Structure 1
Amino acid sequence: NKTVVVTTILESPYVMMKKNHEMLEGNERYEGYCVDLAAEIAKHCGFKYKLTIVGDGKYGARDADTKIWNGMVGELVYGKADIAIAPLTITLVREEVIDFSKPFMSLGISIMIKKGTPIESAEDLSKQTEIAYGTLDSGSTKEFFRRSKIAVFDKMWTYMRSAEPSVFVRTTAEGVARVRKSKGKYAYLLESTMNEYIEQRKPCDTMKVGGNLDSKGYGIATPKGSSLGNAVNLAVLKLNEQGLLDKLKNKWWYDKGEC
């Protein structure tokens, strides 16, 4: 048995630095939903592990030119990590190079506005020019728009791909900050999970509006044909059935809500 290298990402409330992290070591430096989940998955599958934050701070995309995978997906593909336990979206292009468990959390793409912004829907955003809108610059949300053949979303993509200055952001935090500082003139397209979390954080000035644009999930990912895939999947099923995943969601989203 060797220590399992876990790749993950600093994304609230999934993985965060503990206030006193400088005084702590190894796994104890972090907290959050995915930190709690990693401990349970390791316990139920019988392995020791080490949490590592993804070097480039990215989720995972393949460069169209170089064909190289970046982010957490890259760490799995190139053998730098053994498992990714993070809000990593299950997608077809990813499933072709890595394996995912059954989804441990559901989510869909959603709209974040600064409160009072006169927008209620994706259709609203597409039919106007006063309010800019964008996505995380690398990730499944961007690809959803890039690939969509649905009229409303294709229209949004045509706008976003050509908008100047860029409407895309490097991190979720950057997108949230941009909504907060843009006096209602920027809306952010991000996953419902992160949207709902931020909605419950001070200064309580953002809101999720409209229905979700799609319906998907986060999965625990392992390299193709990993020895861990089967047991990890069974552990996700057990934890779902025992209500732990619901308990953890409540713990990190709503029990700690500031609004």
Structure 2
Amino acid sequence: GANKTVVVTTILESPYVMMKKNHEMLEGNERYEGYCVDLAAEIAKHCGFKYKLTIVGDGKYGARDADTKIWNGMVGELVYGKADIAIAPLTITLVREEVIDFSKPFMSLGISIMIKKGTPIESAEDLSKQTEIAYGTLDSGSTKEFFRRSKIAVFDKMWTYMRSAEPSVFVRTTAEGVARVRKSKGKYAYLLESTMNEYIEQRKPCDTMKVGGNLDSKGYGIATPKGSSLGNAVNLAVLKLNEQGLLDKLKNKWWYDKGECGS
């Protein structure tokens, strides 16, 4: 077939994809900036394709409903043919690998705890052993599924609390979770990936921090629908970019070089 513009699905999640300050006066890919915007340009160059960035319609990463077996989020967009590739902080997981393909990781990470400074919590075990401080995760993502599935004693205890907590402890976006931490006087802690936690630590008003070790070790990958003609070349491109130090340069650029909480 003739070369065709590749539809990239991605998600508005800082600092992966953000609206440029002057985005109103801009069009197409130029509306956006961030780690994954930089990454997409590199991947496309190396794989020889043109592309259009599109923000996922429902603003979700992607989960499958247990009853209907229907997928949402970026995973759904790939599964149902609405996008050709996902270039986003999308976690490589078993249930996703059953339906789509992933490159080798472009970033390594694990689940972690965000607190408002001063909150007397230093571990997941700490959270599990008390009830004064509420805690939750993002909806329709891999962190929620981690807790739902885990048989580890501490993590299952946390799930049991989170699933039946009222008012709901789950949030629709990472930014909503961060806002909740900031305004809840230390009575809400947020479970999120170390990458996002470390970024938010670097942002004003510098009132949050990561505590504890990571709960797991996993990775983000570039995802393609099964049968895509792009998967092999994308995988090799990710590995090249990692080996040439480009991925590390992009992390430093978006996380630390312009961190707002000092040197």
In the superposition, the TM-score normalised over structure 2's length comes to 0.98
Identity of aligned residues (%): 100
Aligned to 2:4: 2
Shift of 1:64: 1.2
RMSD: 0.4
| Residues in 2 aligned to 1:256 and 1:94: alpha-carbon distance in whole angstroms | 34
Shift of 1:225: 1.8
Shift of 1:149: 0.4
Aligned to 1:205: 207
Shift of 1:44: 0.2
| Residues in 1 aligned to 2:7 and 2:164: alpha-carbon distance in whole angstroms | 39
Shift of 1:66: 1.6
| Residues in 1 aligned to 2:150 and 2:69: alpha-carbon distance in whole angstroms | 22
Aligned to 2:70: 68
Offset from partner CA, 1:173-213 (integer Å, 9 cap, x none): 00000000000000000000000000000000000000000
| Residues in 1 aligned to 2:245 and 2:179: alpha-carbon distance in whole angstroms | 34
Shift of 1:254: 0.1
| Residues in 1 aligned to 2:139 and 2:44: alpha-carbon distance in whole angstroms | 32
Unaligned 5+ residue runs, structure 1? none
Offset from partner CA, 1:147-173 (integer Å, 9 cap, x none): 000000000001101110000000000
Shift of 1:111: 0.1
| Residues in 2 aligned to 1:175 and 1:29: alpha-carbon distance in whole angstroms | 25
Does residue 224 (structure 1) correspond to residue 226 (structure 2)? The answer is yes
SS in structure 2 of the partner of residue 230 of structure 1: helix
| Residues in 2 aligned to 1:137 and 1:242: alpha-carbon distance in whole angstroms | 35
Shift of 1:31: 0.1
How many residues are paired up?
A: 259
Shift of 1:256: 1.1
Q: Comparing 64-73 with 213-222, which one deviates more in the overlay?
A: 64-73
| Residues in 1 aligned to 2:157 and 2:68: alpha-carbon distance in whole angstroms | 29
Unaligned 5+ residue runs, structure 2? none
Does residue 49 (structure 1) correspond to residue 51 (structure 2)? The answer is yes
SS in structure 1 of the partner of residue 7 of structure 2: strand
| Residues in 1 aligned to 2:30 and 2:110: alpha-carbon distance in whole angstroms | 31
SS in structure 1 of the partner of residue 15 of structure 2: coil
- Counterpart among 116, 119, 142 of residue 118 in structure 2: 116
Offset from partner CA, 1:68-97 (integer Å, 9 cap, x none): 110000000000100000000000000000
| Residues in 2 aligned to 1:210 and 1:153: alpha-carbon distance in whole angstroms | 14
SS in structure 1 of the partner of residue 147 of structure 2: helix
SS in structure 1 of the partner of residue 59 of structure 2: coil
Q: Structure 1: which 4+ aligned runs deviate by more than 3 Å? A: none
| Residues in 2 aligned to 1:185 and 1:118: alpha-carbon distance in whole angstroms | 10
Offset from partner CA, 1:34-71 (integer Å, 9 cap, x none): 00000000000000000000000000001112211100
| Residues in 2 aligned to 1:30 and 1:137: alpha-carbon distance in whole angstroms | 24
| Residues in 2 aligned to 1:169 and 1:221: alpha-carbon distance in whole angstroms | 24
- Counterpart among 86, 90, 93 of residue 91 in structure 1: 93
Offset from partner CA, 1:77-131 (integer Å, 9 cap, x none): 0001000000000000000000000000001000000000000000000000000
Aligned to 1:160: 162
1:1-259 residue pairs with structure 2 within 5 A? Answer: 1-259=3-261
SS in structure 1 of the partner of residue 96 of structure 2: helix
| Residues in 1 aligned to 2:161 and 2:130: alpha-carbon distance in whole angstroms | 10
| Residues in 1 aligned to 2:219 and 2:156: alpha-carbon distance in whole angstroms | 22
Offset from partner CA, 1:196-237 (integer Å, 9 cap, x none): 000000000000000000000000000002100000000001
| Residues in 2 aligned to 1:64 and 1:107: alpha-carbon distance in whole angstroms | 27
SS in structure 2 of the partner of residue 14 of structure 1: coil
